[PDB]
Amino acid sequence: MQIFVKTLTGKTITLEVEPSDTIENVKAKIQDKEGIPPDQQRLIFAGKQLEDGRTLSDYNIQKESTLHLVLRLRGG
Amino acid sequence: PVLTRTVVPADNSALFTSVYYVVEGGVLNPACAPEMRRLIAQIVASDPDFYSEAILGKTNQEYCDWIKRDDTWGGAIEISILSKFYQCEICVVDTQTVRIDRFGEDAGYTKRVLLIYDGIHYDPLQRNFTPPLTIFSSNDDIVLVQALELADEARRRR
């Protein structure tokens, strides 16, 4: 199953996975690809934030669907 | 030439002050922050489809009041917005993982500015030689490497 992830920077990341991986494990595969720490990631799909400890396809995420990465990076 | 960090106050507005400093040519002024906050809310309010509750984390109006506060931190949302506004590539180098996040990499702008992030605070980066250089060619990839070295030297220190 192949998905696309569009980041805040504009980059479109294509992630190789299966519809029974944890969201915290998606953040693990994302970190193996972009070096972004999972504790800075916020995954979102279909106007809904994805919660850790849950599988994809639980929210109708099919192959060739587009999910969203929002970096936190708050700093003052 | 050498890449250096310029220290801006950690008064909750460091992101705004750091951005202002590098787009404006090496101008340090923590007063730009309210109008920079006001711009942001202005942009976010004008498109509640793109800046929905999911993307933001709060509701679109709730977020606009939040970012207007003087004690609330800017993050990647503000960077992305500012990037589009200043028509610039804002590159953020992390001291914690020594990595670069290029905001606006997909637009093809003619300039890029560099910020340094340590998890709670932003500082701006500049070149020294003669006034400092803060804006660079988006084809200048030596500053990218120069910043990494800088960030990693920081990382060592911690």
Residue numbers in the entry:
A (entry chain B): 1 to 76
B (entry chain A): 147 to 275, 280 to 308
Give verbatim lines from the article:
Sixteen ovarian tumor (OTU) family deubiquitinases (DUBs) exist in humans, and most members regulate cell-signaling cascades. Biochemical analysis and five crystal structures of OTU DUBs with or without Ub substrates reveal four mechanisms of linkage specificity. Mechanistic and structural studies of three closely related, unstudied OTUs with distinct cleavage profiles revealed four mechanisms for achieving linkage specificity, namely (1) the use of additional Ub-binding domains (UBDs), (2) specific recognition of a ubiquitinated sequence, (3) the use of a conserved S1’ Ub-binding site on the OTU domain itself, and (4) the use of an S2 site enabling DUBs to bind longer chains in a linkage-specific manner. We selected three members of the OTUD family for additional investigation: the unstudied Lys63-specific OTUD1, the cdc48/p97 interactor OTUD2 that cleaves atypical linkages (Lys11, Lys27, Lys29, and Lys33), and OTUD3, another unstudied DUB with activity against Lys6- and Lys11-linked diUb.
In a structure of inactive OTUD2 C160A in complex with Lys11-linked diUb, the diUb molecule did not bind across the active site but occupied S1 and a previously unidentified S2 site on OTUD2. The S2 site is formed by two exposed hydrophobic residues (Ile292 and Val295) on the C-terminal OTUD2 α helix that bind the hydrophobic Ile44 patch of Ub. The orientation of Ub bound to the S2 site most likely allows preferential binding of Lys11-polyUb, given that the S2 Ub points with its C terminus toward Lys11 of the S1 Ub. The S2 site in OTUD2 is conserved in higher eukaryotes but not in yOtu1 and dmOtu1. We tested whether the S2 site was functionally relevant in isolated catalytic domains of OTUD2 variants and mutated Ile292 and Val295 to Gln (referred to as OTUD2 MutS2), which did not affect reactivity or diUb specificity. All proteins hydrolyzed Lys11-diUb similarly, but Lys11-linked tri- and tetra-Ub were more rapidly cleaved to di- and mono-Ub by WT OTUD2, whereas OTUD2 MutS2 or dmOtu1 did not show enhanced activity for longer Lys11-linked chains. The accumulation of Lys11-linked diUb indicated that this product might be stabilized by binding the S1 and S2 sites on OTUD2, as was observed in the complex structures, although OTUD2 MutS2 did not show enhanced diUb cleavage. The S2 site specifically enhanced the cleavage of Lys11-linked polyUb, given that Lys6-, Lys48-, or Lys63-linked triUb were less well hydrolyzed by WT OTUD2 in comparison to MutS2 or were not hydrolyzed at all. Hence the presence of an S2 site on the OTUD2 catalytic domain allows it to specifically target longer Lys11-linked chains, revealing an additional mechanism of OTU specificity. Our structural studies of Ub and diUb complexes for OTUD2 unexpectedly revealed another mechanism that targets OTUD2 to longer Ub chains.
